[PDB]
Amino acid sequence: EPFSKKEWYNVKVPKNFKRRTVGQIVVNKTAGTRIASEQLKGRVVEVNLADLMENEKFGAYNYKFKCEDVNGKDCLMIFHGLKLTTDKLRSIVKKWCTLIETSVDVKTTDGHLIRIFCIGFTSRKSNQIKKTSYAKSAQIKKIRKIMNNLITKEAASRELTQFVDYLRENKLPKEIVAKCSKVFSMDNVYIRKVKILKAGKIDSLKLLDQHQ
Amino acid sequence: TSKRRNNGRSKKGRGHTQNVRCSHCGRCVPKDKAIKRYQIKNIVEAAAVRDISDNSALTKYKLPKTYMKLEYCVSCGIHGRVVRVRSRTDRRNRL
Amino acid sequence: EVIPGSTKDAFGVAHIYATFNDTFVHVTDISGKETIIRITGGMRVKADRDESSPYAAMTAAQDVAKRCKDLGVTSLHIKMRGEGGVYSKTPGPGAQAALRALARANMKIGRIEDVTPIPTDCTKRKGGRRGRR
Amino acid sequence: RTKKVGIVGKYGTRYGASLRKVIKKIEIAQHSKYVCPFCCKEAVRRTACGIWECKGCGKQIAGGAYTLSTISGATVRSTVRRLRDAKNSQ
RNA sequence: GACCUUAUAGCUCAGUGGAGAGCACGGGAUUUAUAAUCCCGGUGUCAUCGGUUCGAUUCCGAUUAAGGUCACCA
RNA sequence: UUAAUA
RNA sequence: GAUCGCUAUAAGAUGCACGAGAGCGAAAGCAUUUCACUCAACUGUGUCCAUUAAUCAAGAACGAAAGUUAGGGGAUCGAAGACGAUCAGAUACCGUCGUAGUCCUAACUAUAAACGAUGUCAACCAAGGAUUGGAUGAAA
């Protein structure tokens, strides 16, 4: 029997989310020199945002977490990254517009080095009659420069935990559209992916503050 | 001689365009000469959409679709009935 | 009594990967590193031309569900996928049949997704300039 | 004087057309004068394998076997400058 | 010359103490007709003599053909 | 899947 | 211990969707975003010169891909080659593996259905709608 040596651990996300438990993961029982709590020190868990916040309006994003230490049958997950759902990313790429992309390496105030990817699209106006809405190379560079600089200021002041919660608020995509509409009519602005280029140092006290 | 004024392409004051690979036979065709079609379909067929809904774990989950762009060579587009052979006078219609 | 290793009703994720030559139904835990049961369409047939048949896909899907509920996994997440590296991104005919068979086996499907790997940019495709003939 | 055999006419007719071609490119570059990086004069001549001396400037420079600065020796110098600036700035 | 091996249908091979394969050939079918394809059939002195042989095409000698190796120091 | 010739 | 699943790696190559009868270039050709160095053209002009122009045997630059020479790299694909099918045969189409090559640097080669099969310059020339980039009024 394969599952005779298997035991399940409860998965606990940090307190920033409405839902605290997201599921159970499996691991073989302890052995000679194979400690189960050691073999769970790097597992990565992909969780939708809709489940975390218990609202289906947040279903466009997928979040990722990493098990750092075992608190007696419990992992204490930490935020590993985020990524747009595949169906949403391909549904926002219209044809007769201009696609604008960017990426910034931002050093969060608490020491995390992260890479943030932003995507945007030129839109059609209310009275517009012509089929195509393209932007010159000059307007595109202005727009990318605006969203490069504006996203850096928002993420450089706040630490990683609060910045991710700041992403849940639609202020940044709304601010970018409002600021970039002075250069060209923009409608769709999303932050499609965030990585962790260099993990900032963390302490068991810091994890405790992040877990109740 | 010239069956088409545009030679069957979409080429103009360019004069070299990159290749794209056919979706069926894997042939190399130029980007403008390729027969481009767009597909937007749900990942659940119309038979199983009811069956998926009945035993689900989400209250108001909206079924996502799949979007992909298919490019066919002339040989692999005519055989697959993507485009048909038209009349001599009906060839000129671009609608 | 309880099968060892089983637990209360939990969440699993089913990796349905059906090409035009076979079909894979493969459920893993939430982390994805531990696999509960992995059945392919080629284990439920005799000849080599029926491994992609819809019947082989549902037969492999029912056996996955029977083991999953018996092992405590009662609800699943679906990750549909085809051979889409540089080849046809359309999933095979058995992928839909396997997904429908999981539902009809009284399983609570969660979030469905298409995870066929779309290249940002591709390596050279098999066949040559003139392609399959 | 000669149609095409410029500097390798001293080898006569006794080493092979290909080998006399390869040695020609090296022997031209080995005997030519280079621009001297400290005084901007065409006055650097080779004195030994890897040692170059600015004739009208009084400097001895270490370089390639036959050319004053090698292609690999120039990219390395550029690479270190990029690394040093990055290290010096944060 | 001396040692060794082989000899089976019209052609290449199998197998033999109580003769298969293929290709070829003949007849029938398919085709407008041939080729291909399908169906059926007829083909071996087991190289020529003696002996053991219950009984030899097989085992043992002989006569032939066919090849392979050797034929050196002077 | 295969499909030569007059 | 394959196919499959998650996680980490380090090189090669490529540059999806946007991407179009749209743009640039003498043609060949050019698609990740930034910073430099250049270049050309259009529009605007009560700015300067004053025929400096057009086309051009000989002559000279650039010239896809393949190919050659010498280094580096060598992931994917793959003339040759080797298997397995199909066939009467199959040295082919189909499948598997796979050397040169495909990639970068230096130097040769100088040919393509290098096509708009339409030489370069200039004048006149029937109705439209739309589009790329300027100028100029109205409409925020």
Tokens (6 digits) for B11: 């080429």
C31 is near strand G: CB distance < 7 Å: yes
Residues 12-71 on C with a CB inside 8 Å of B are none
Give Cβ neighbours of residue C115 (< 8 Å, ≥ 6 apart). Answer: A86, C79, C80, C81
**Closest CA of chain A from B66, distance in Å:** 6
A2 is near strand G: CB distance < 7 Å: no
Cα separation of D48 and D55, whole Å? 14
What is the strand order of the sheet C35-40 is part of?
Answer: C35-40, C23-28, C10-18, C73-81, C108-114
- What are the residue ranges of helices labelled H in chain A? 49-53, 86-91, 137-157, 160-168, 171-180, 204-210
- Geometric angle at alpha carbon A106, from A65 and A211, rounded to 5°: 30
> Could you identify the residue whose CA is nearest to the C1' atom of nucleotide G78?
C128
Tokens (6 digits) for A143: 């727009």
Out of A50, A56, A87, closest to residue B64 by CB: A87
Cβ atoms within 10 Å, residue D71: 9
> Could you identify the residue whose CA is nearest to the C1' atom of nucleotide G30?
B16
The size of chain D, in residues, is 90
**Residue D36 Cα distances to A61, A108, D52, D62, angstroms:** 61, 48, 10, 12
The structure's method of determination equals cryo-EM
Positions 34-63 of C with beta carbon below 7 A from strand G are 35, 38, 40
Where are the extended beta strands (E) located within chain A?
A: 6-12, 21-28, 44-48, 61-70, 74-84, 99-107, 113-122, 186-194
Neighbours of chain A (3+ CB pairs under 8 A): B, C
H, E, C per residue of C4-44: CCCCCCEEEEEEEEECCCCEEEEEECCCCCCEEEEEEHHHC
Judging contacts by C-beta atoms under 8 Å, the chain B residues touching residue C129 are: 27-28
With residue C56 as reference, give the H or E element that holds it. Answer: helix C54-70
A48 alpha carbon, distance to own chain's centre: 10
Report residue A54: phi and psi, to 5°.
55, 35
Positions 1-30 of B with beta carbon below 7 A from strand G are 1-2, 5-7, 10-18, 20
Cα separation of A157 and A147, whole Å? 16
Q: What radius of gyration do chain A's Cα atoms show?
A: 21
